[PDB]
């Protein structure tokens, strides 16, 4: 389409938290019941540095706050804590211009869209909604993310739905290995008012896309609520590393707990003896 231009472009300073013990996922799709399993994959190490930003979804007031372009490294743990679905998606790639291919995973209200093209992205990717007073409902009618999209190699549009326009915790793990972009997700209703919640929750496999592209950077896409005229969303980013994890499955197959073997000498002995007992 045609990008909307902003004369005043700023971005909030980044802030740091900690990964606690989140980011664990199911490496294989194998049913495992009442057993400890060890695999070496790209995991988010326990108590890792986590950077977190805010997605300003309302202007109240002519300053455009932009999301920053972050490194991808070997993979990312992405989490967001918002009430209404402010976080809409991400763009992935290297140069993020028409010179290379770029991944676009966006969630407009109807369905989820996954495309890989030579995008010429906008300076400020925009997604707009306005309130339909006569229907008492929000309707998103602005989608200005890229100015060009040529020589596409991948396209995916899911079946239509209606997205509803107590905080929500949505977690993702992104892994780009052997030409496959593998995604894992988990949604739990959190009660916290500020910050990432401490706890454990195993992320289930969402989809792995044979995109076959190189990804070194990414950027987050959010929604803007157009108002006539303060509780913004927050997202969290951690980085995966090659680690050996000891995973615990219950009798139903759910990963209930894990041990980061290389975290400390206590866990190193936990994995050597293949037990979850710290009093040993």
């Amino acid at each position, epitope marked *: 389409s*045609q990008c909307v231009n902003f004369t005043t472009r700023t971005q909030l300073p980044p802030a740091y938290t900690n990964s606690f013990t989140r980011g664990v996922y199911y490496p294989d799709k194998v049913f495992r019941s009442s057993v400890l399993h060890s695999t070496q994959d790209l995991f988010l190490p326990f108590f890792s540095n986590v950077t977190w930003f805010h997605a300003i979804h309302v*202007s109240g*007031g002519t300053k*455009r706050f932009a999301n920053p372009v972050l490194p991808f490294n070997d993979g990312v743990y992405f989490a967001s804590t918002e009430k209404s679905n402010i976080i809409r998606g991400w763009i992935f790639g290297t140069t993020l211009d028409s010179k290379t291919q770029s991944l676009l995973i966006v969630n407009n209200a109807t369905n989820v869209v996954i495309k890989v093209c030579e995008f010429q992205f906008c300076n400020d990717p925009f997604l707009g909604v*306005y309130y339909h007073k006569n229907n008492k409902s929000w309707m998103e009618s602005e989608f200005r993310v890229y100015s060009s999209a040529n020589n596409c190699t991948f396209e995916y549009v899911s079946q239509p739905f209606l997205m509803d326009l107590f905080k929500n915790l949505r977690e993702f793990v992104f892994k780009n290995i052997d030409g496959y972009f593998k995604i894992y997700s988990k949604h739990t209703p959190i009660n916290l008012v500020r910050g990432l919640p401490q706890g454990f929750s195993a992320l289930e496999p969402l989809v792995d896309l044979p995109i076959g592209i190189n990804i070194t950077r990414f950027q987050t896409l959010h929604i803007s609520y157009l*108002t006539p005229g303060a509780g913004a969303a927050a997202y969290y980013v951690g980085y995966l590393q090659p680690r050996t994890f000891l995973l615990k499955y219950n009798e139903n197959g759910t990963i209930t707990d894990a041990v980061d073997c290389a975290l400390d000498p206590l866990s190193e002995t936990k994995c050597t003896l293949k037990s979850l007992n710290d009093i040993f």
Partner: antibody
Amino acid sequence: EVQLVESGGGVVQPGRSLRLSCAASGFTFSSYGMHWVRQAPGKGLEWVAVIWYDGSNNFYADSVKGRFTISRDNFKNTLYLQMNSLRAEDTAVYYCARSYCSGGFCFGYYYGLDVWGQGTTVTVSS
Amino acid sequence: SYELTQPPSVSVAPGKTATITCGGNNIGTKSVHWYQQKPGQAPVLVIYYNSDRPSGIPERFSGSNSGNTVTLTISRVEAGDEADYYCQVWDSGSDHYVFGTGTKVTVVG
């Protein structure tokens, strides 16, 4: 004292150019997005172009794209329309109108063209 | 381009009501504005945001936008209401402000 004053219209042969003007007074000019809407004699309304409050964005009509240029001077409260390569089908009365911009956005969901100018007549004939 | 359909003419007796139909594609998702233009002068915004009246427009005018049925309504029609009426939207799918074809409202009498 809210008023819009168009000028610059005239009679012109095809190919020639013409610069329209729209002087605004009585309100905060830099708070409104400005439009051009033309009306051919005996015909309906046709939207020409829009420019946002600070001139950072502008959208043109397909019929005038590549030939018309819209601009605004915010320290003089004036809207402009440059019209090149004029054709007989550009003959109309040209109106300028304001519409409130929410908070850096002049899309037109919450506000419409609430104030219109008197208009200026443009005729293109051989 | 994006099409906005209107009936070319509507006739009504004084004191009765007139209904003007704006035809659009997925117009139930758009915000329709209405303009009155009496012959000889510039159009006047009479309904914006589908149903809001400006400060000076009398309460006889009203608009709706429900179930793909956007409609301008003028009750207690007077002879002074004889004008052309246009609906207008912002179509982001084409970066165009689109005006309807128009409706001439003559008062039978």
